[PDB]
A paper describes a structure:
Upon meiosis onset, Mmi1 is lured by a ribonucleoprotein (RNP) complex, composed of the nucleocytoplasmic shuttling RNA-binding protein [name] and the DSR-containing [name] meiRNA, that accumulates in a single nuclear body overlapping the meiRNA-encoding sme2 + gene. Both [name] and meiRNA are essential for the assembly of this structure and the completion of sexual differentiation. Interestingly, [name] mutants lacking the [name] domain (residues 592 to 750, hereafter called RRM3Mei2) failed to accumulate meiotic mRNAs, suggesting that [name] RNA-binding activity is required to inhibit Mmi1 function. In this study, we show that the RNA-binding activities of Mmi1 and [name] are crucial for their mutual control during mitosis and further identify a [name], termed mamRNA, as a major regulatory and bridging partner for both proteins in the nucleus.
Author numbering: 580 to 726
The structure:
Amino acid sequence: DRNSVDYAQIASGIDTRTTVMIKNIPNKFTQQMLRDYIDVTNKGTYDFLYLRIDFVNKCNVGYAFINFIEPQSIITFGKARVGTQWNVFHSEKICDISYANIQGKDRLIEKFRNSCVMDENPAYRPKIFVSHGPNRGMEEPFPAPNN
């Protein structure tokens, strides 16, 4: 499909999309567990991260948005994790990815800055990180509502 990830197309430079959906996330996985999981192989390679929590059902939504700074970092993540089991909470689910319909850190910021999710516990809010320079990967304060 239009959102399937093909590592060879990324390597050859014919698909430069950077926003990816991390799929089949176990119900009880947290955003901290996801950040740590990604940091095993991809620390400092992404500049947007969000795993939405459903507070009523005590679970995450099952997928996360991640914006990689360089499209090549999708190969690093994918080749290490895609097709492997999460191996937490006795889940049978496997890590998988596809491209998101929304593309880029700026579009992601604009999608959540005015959202009601910014009113929840600061620890569970979407995150942005420095995209370039010596501090690349360091968390940045999320921009305030545009209204």
